[PDB]
Amino acid sequence: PVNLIFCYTILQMKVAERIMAQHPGERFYVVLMSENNNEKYDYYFNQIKDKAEWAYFFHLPYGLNKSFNFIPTMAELKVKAMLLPKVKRIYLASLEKVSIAAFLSTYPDAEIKTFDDGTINLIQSSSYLGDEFSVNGTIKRNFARMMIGDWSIAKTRNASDEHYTIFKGLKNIMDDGRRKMTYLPLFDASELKAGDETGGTVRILLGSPDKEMKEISEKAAKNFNIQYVAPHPRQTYGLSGVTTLNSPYVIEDYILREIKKNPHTRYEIYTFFSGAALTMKDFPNVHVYALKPASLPEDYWLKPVYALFTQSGIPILTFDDK
Amino acid sequence: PVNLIFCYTILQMKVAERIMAQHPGERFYVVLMSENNNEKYDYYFNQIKDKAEWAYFFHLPYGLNKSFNFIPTMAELKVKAMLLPKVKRIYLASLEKVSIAAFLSTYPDAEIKTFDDGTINLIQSSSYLGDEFSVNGTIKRNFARMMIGDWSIAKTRNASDEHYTIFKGLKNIMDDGRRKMTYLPLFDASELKAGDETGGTVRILLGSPDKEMKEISEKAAKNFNIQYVAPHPRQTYGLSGVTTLNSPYVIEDYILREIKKNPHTRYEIYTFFSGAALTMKDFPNVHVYALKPASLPEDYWLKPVYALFTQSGIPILTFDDK
Ligand SMILES: CC(=O)N[C@@H]1[C@@H](O)[C@@H](F)[C@@](OP(=O)(O)OC[C@H]2O[C@@H](n3ccc(N)nc3=O)[C@H](O)[C@@H]2O)(C(=O)O)O[C@H]1[C@H](O)[C@H](O)CO
Ligand SMILES: CC(=O)N[C@@H]1[C@@H](O)[C@@H](F)[C@@](OP(=O)(O)OC[C@H]2O[C@@H](n3ccc(N)nc3=O)[C@H](O)[C@@H]2O)(C(=O)O)O[C@H]1[C@H](O)[C@H](O)CO
């Protein structure tokens, strides 16, 4: 059972030390957040880091704080005012309305617009009320209760007049009639120039960052005659028996580039339900398949995942991974 | 007139690019906040950094986000729950109740306690209503209106039952009868062991981080026969004609150490109204003097500064710096 201490000055770090002293042997996680980095801050952060179970130094940019911990001189007031950006518009992910609410309030006249957080935006309200998520005290119900509370805040606090979504024609959690819904594709079909799939077929497995998925991935590659793996940005193990694509791009960027260079090629994307399937749903010459290993429980994924994939016309291919 | 974009994923960075594309030549400040650092995040941050006027990558710790931008698997839900700290107590600076309100709400059952932000805590409510701060549209009135709004939030939202102050016997802005006020000194007199000032006198000027203060500082040192300067943690210029103390400690730490080693020495601290004067007000064998250069306007400092210094028994020494 931990105590947290949040500090943004050296003296607050000393105070934090005094508090720790009065609670000897208890567990403390100390956070320092400052815009200034200099010898003294590091010296004092190191000091409190030796005394706490866990400490972190969040580094911020110069000018972030509109507020003052000290009593400013008139000059310091002038400097601060004539430095602050004059902000006309803030764009942020719908759920960042919750996590950065405090900052939005310091710019009450800015026009706010939101964009998809990601595939989280595709779970409808009524789905959070589903029986899956309605057992009191369970992990799934805590998730749903947390989402419902946050969407409510994102939708009704700090008014925003527009939401950009990257998912054409799936109902968005943000579409509540209090804002314009605007489709914002990741590409322009005009610049891509894809034509008829008269050329060949390229098969790619989307790698998983979970290492327990290694054998299952390797078995999928064989079972389905898949030439390539595109590793996940956080994937840290290698897959054998398949050609790994070493590219600097995430899959959507990689595939859009390859389509432009190969406008007649058929790309087949196979995945263990990555959100990239929903993100690439409407890319030309792209055909997504979901893979379902028999050895995983039917409820490995939440029910809305199957429903979005199915609504989106994405086949689910089951296979006995043994 | 700037636009801000806040992002916490790679794809949100692409979206941010699309938005920028639709607003060609306008000014954009882009912020990326993530717990994950890997090749792909840096590649994509660099990319958007080449496209925006200003961009920053705030690095956060692993686990910070209780929320999800994607639809989690059951396994990912389990991992997240069994990782989150069980928090019993949060200590934070009174004004951090405002800036980190969003985080407090994710731990609604934690006991919250606050401590001084700093000398800002010593300006009373009625003082913000002073005539100095009551001219509509001025920089001082915007400051007061901002403080009044934030203290109100800090005092009445997310209930906290106790405030630690480091300033004995000056009225605190947080003392509103909705919390215990607790004095928390920076030292124990029991461990310091200061005795009668039978030894010698040490005179120290507190350096200023403002370089326009250089000549004035150097003239003060001569006029007042001050042996030493203790530079401010952000001071970046050197003072001539005085011995600069090269120490790793801030003044309060330095002086407490020197007192313990020299319990009969008289320390005289001279300052251009540093908050360290108020912080060290009640240190044994310490005698603080405020310095007021004739060449600065009478309103260089705000009126509550003079009043706190005067209430605290701190002489103000005027001198014609020429
Ligand atoms: C905080 C957190 O966990 N974030 C995770 C990310 O670290 C990863 F863990 C995961 O990834 P997941 O659904 O599969 O896919 C998310 C994005 O990762 C890229 N990708 C994925 C697989 C692959 N083989 N090649 C790729 O290039 C695509 O751009 C895709 O749209 C997850 O659920 O495992 O979910 C994402 C976020 O949803 C995403 O990073 C931003 O939209
Ligand atoms: C964000 C921001 O501007 N922060 C500023 C700091 O960078 C500096 F700019 C200033 O400093 P100021 O009142 O003089 O004093 C603040 C603290 O700095 C240390 N000190 C100061 C002068 C000196 N010669 N030797 C020292 O060791 C002491 O610990 C003192 O209590 C300012 O008003 O100029 O105010 C502080 C904060 O109030 C302080 O850092 C935390 O309490």
Amino acid letter, residue A22: Q
Q: Rounded to whole angstroms, how far apart are CA atoms A170 and A147?
A: 18
Owner of token pair 């636009």: B3
Pick from B120, B185, B234: which is nearest to A70 by CB? B120
List, in sequence order, every residue forming a beta bridge with B33; answer none if it has no partner: B58
Residues of B with catalytic function: 210, 232
Ligand nearest to the CA of A251: 1
CB atoms within 10 A of CB B131: 7
Q: Rounded to whole angstroms, how far apart are CA atoms B300 and B296?
A: 6
Q: Do residue A4 and residue B234 have CB atoms under 8 angstroms apart? A: no
A252 lines ligand 1 (CB under 6 A): yes
Do residues A245 and A230 make contact, with C-beta atoms less than 8 angstroms apart? yes
Let me know whether A137 and A151 are in one domain.
Answer: yes
Q: Which of A51, A82, A113 is the last residue of a domain?
A: A82
Q: Rounded to whole angstroms, how far apart are CA atoms B41 and A73?
A: 41
Total residues found in chain A within this entry: 322
Closest Cα in chain B, distance from residue A229 (Å)? 16
Residues of A in contact with B307 (CB under 8 A): none
Let me know whether B111 and B186 are in one domain.
Answer: yes
* Total count of domains within chain B: 2
Let me know whether A288 and A254 are in one domain.
Answer: yes
Q: Which of A82, A102, A120 is the last residue of a domain?
A: A82
Backbone angles phi, psi at A46, to 5 degrees: -60, -45
Minimal-distance CA residue to ligand 2 atom 38: A70
Residues of A in contact with B123 (CB under 8 A): 71
Let me know whether B244 and B106 are in one domain.
Answer: yes
Active-site residue, from A175, A176, A232, A287:
A232
What lies within 8 Å, CB to CB, of B279 at 6+ separation is A11, B119, B166, B167, B186, B252
Alpha-carbon torsion (B192, B195, B200, B206), positive or negative: positive
Let me know whether B155 and B235 are in one domain.
Answer: yes
List, in sequence order, every residue forming a beta bridge with B270; answer none if it has no partner: B205, B289
Closest CA to B30 of B48, B42, B9, B11: B48
Q: Rounded to whole angstroms, how far apart are CA atoms A69 and A9?
A: 8
Do residues A10 and A57 make contact, with C-beta atoms less than 8 angstroms apart? no
Pick from B85, B233, B279: which is nearest to A40 by CB? B233
Q: Rounded to whole angstroms, how far apart are CA atoms B304 and B137?
A: 20
Q: Do residue A91 and residue B139 have CB atoms under 8 angstroms apart? A: no
A169 lines ligand 1 (CB under 6 A): no
Q: Rounded to whole angstroms, how far apart are CA atoms B296 and B284?
A: 32
List, in sequence order, every residue forming a beta bridge with B12; answer none if it has no partner: none
Query: At B18, which CATH number?
Result: 3.30.370.20
Closest CA to A63 of A36, A38, A44, A45: A36
Helical (H) or strand (E) element with A298: none
State the SS3 of chain B: CEEEEEECCHHHHHHHHHHHHCCCCCEEEEEEEECCCCHHHHHHHHHHHHHCCEEEEEECCCCCCCCCCCCCCHHHHHHHHHHCCCEEEEEEECCHHHHCHHHHCCCCCCEEEEECCCHHHHCCHHHHCCHHHCCCCCHHHHHHHHHHHHHHHHHHCCCCCEEEECCCCCCCCCCCCCCEEEECCCCCHHHHCCCCCCCCEEEEEECCCCHHHHHHHHHHHHHCCCCEEECCCCCCCCCCCCEECCCCCCHHHHHHHHHHHCCCCEEEEEECCCCHHHHHCCCCCEEEEEEEECCCCCCCCCHHHHHHHHHCCCCEEEECCC
Burial class of residue A9 in the structure, from the number of CB atoms within 10 Å of its CB (0-12 exposed, 13-18 middle, 19+ buried): buried
> Residues with Cβ within 6 A of ligand 2?
A 9-11, 36, 69-70; B 118, 206-207, 209, 230-234, 250-252, 274-276, 279
Structure tokens at A172: 């968005």
Contacts from A243-246 at CB under 8 Å and sequence distance 24+?
A: A244/A207, A245/A204
Closest Cα in chain B, distance from residue A223 (Å)? 24
Residues of B in contact with A34 (CB under 8 A): none
A287 marked ligand binding residue: no
Amino acid letter, residue B217: S
Let me know whether B120 and B220 are in one domain.
Answer: yes
Q: String of b and e for A119-149 (b: at least 16 CB within 10 Å)?
A: bbbbbbeebbebebbeeeeeebebbbeebee
Q: Rounded to whole angstroms, how far apart are CA atoms B25 and B288?
A: 54
Let me know whether A66 and A155 are in one domain.
Answer: no
Q: List the strands of the sheet with B286-293, edge to edge.
A: B243-244, B228-230, B201-206, B266-271, B286-293, B316-319
Structure tokens at B252: 């309060």
**Ligand 1 mean position to A233 CA, how many Å?**
7
Q: What is the dihedral of CA A77, A82, A83, A84, to 10 degrees?
A: 90
Helical (H) or strand (E) element with A75: helix A74-83
Q: What's the alpha-carbon Rg for chain B, to the nearest Å?
A: 25
Let me know whether A5 and A106 are in one domain.
Answer: no
The technique is: X-ray
Owner of token pair 């389509």: A259
Do residues A224 and A319 make contact, with C-beta atoms less than 8 angstroms apart? yes
Q: Do residue B90 and residue A8 have CB atoms under 8 angstroms apart? A: no
Backbone angles phi, psi at B251, to 5 degrees: -50, -40
* Chain B residue closest in CA terms to A15: B186
What lies within 8 Å, CB to CB, of A149 at 6+ separation is none
Let me know whether A208 and A68 are in one domain.
Answer: no
Let me know whether B150 and B77 are in one domain.
Answer: no
B275 marked ligand binding residue: yes
Q: Do residue B91 and residue A166 have CB atoms under 8 angstroms apart? A: no
Let me know whether A119 and A248 are in one domain.
Answer: yes
Closest CA to B283 of B304, B262, B302, B303: B262
Backbone angles phi, psi at B147, to 5 degrees: -60, -45
Q: Rounded to whole angstroms, how far apart are CA atoms A255 and B91?
A: 48
Q: Rounded to whole angstroms, how far apart are CA atoms A12 and A69?
A: 10
B274 marked ligand binding residue: yes
Structure tokens at B58: 């705030």
Ligand nearest to the CA of A205: 1
User: DSSP characters for A170-221?
Assistant: S--TT-SSSSEEEE--SS-HHHH------S-EEEEEE--S-GGGHHHHHHHH
Let me know whether A32 and A127 are in one domain.
Answer: no
Closest CA to A92 of B3, B66, B104: B3
In ligand 1, the atom with minimum distance to the C-alpha of A230 is 24
Q: Which of B48, B82, B116 is the last residue of a domain?
A: B82
Domain residue limits at B276: 83-322
The bridge status of strand A2-7 relative to strand B228-230 is unpaired
**Ligand 1 mean position to A275 CA, how many Å?**
7
Contacts from B190-199 at CB under 8 Å and sequence distance 24+?
A: B191/B260, B192/B256, B192/B259, B192/B260, B192/B263, B192/B284, B193/B260, B193/B263, B194/B259, B194/B263, B194/B284, B194/B285, B195/B263, B195/B264, B196/B264, B197/B264, B197/B265, B197/B266, B197/B285, B198/B264, B199/B262, B199/B264, B199/B265, B199/B266
Q: Rounded to whole angstroms, how far apart are CA atoms B110 and B87?
A: 6
What lies within 8 Å, CB to CB, of A283 at 6+ separation is A187, A252, A255, A256, A259, A267
